[PDB]
Amino acid sequence: PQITLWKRPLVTIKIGGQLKEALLDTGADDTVLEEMNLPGRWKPKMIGGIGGFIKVRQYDQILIEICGHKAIGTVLVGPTPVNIIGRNLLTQIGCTLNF
Amino acid sequence: PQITLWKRPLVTIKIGGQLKEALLDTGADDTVLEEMNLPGRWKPKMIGGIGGFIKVRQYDQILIEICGHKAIGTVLVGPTPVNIIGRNLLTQIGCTLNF
């Protein structure tokens, strides 16, 4: 679909079999989801944005369905204020910016 | 034009008589630019990213040209690591997400 930006570009995602709302974020290198339980091994990591760094758990090769499009890639889980879908997964679903 | 998300969507902007590189950020409500001495009145504001909040200066009705497309709105100035074009200006240039 084509999504305008008058409102936050929020979509429903499915991850670990659970539905959630997330922000399609061209300004995020990585995908960062609020605290949740996910199956599989994980490594501690840290990521920075505006305001400083947060500590996250990095899950690799996680299945996630974004607005009906499947992706398999790295998902960071931590105390992010909003679920954000970053470029590592936006590229997989074929998302582009257009004007 | 169309912009893929393999790399950060960095483009040239023109503001206050200067050329800069900035990030087209669908995950940003607001536009935040690296420290610069714009003329005119401003008001203090605080904006939050994933790591917390920073102090910025809010300038209103500022013209920014983004890839030849003009937009006029509120521009925040403060200690951000990257020039960020947010939805308040991306809407004015007819920018959409497409997949």
Ligand SMILES: COC(=O)N[C@H](C(=O)N[C@@H](Cc1ccccc1)C[C@H](O)[C@H](Cc1ccccc1)NC(=O)O[C@H]1CO[C@H]2OCC[C@H]21)C(C)(C)C
């Ligand atoms: C309403 O609040 C807002 O709109 N705040 C805006 C904001 O911060 N939005 C966040 C999400 C958010 C956070 C908090 C509340 C609501 C939404 C997403 C945004 O695109 C940032 C931009 C950014 C790129 C590079 C370095 C620092 C920042 N990207 C990011 O933090 O990405 C992370 C993840 O991936 C990594 O790559 C880049 C840095 C890493 C802003 C106006 C301050 C800019």
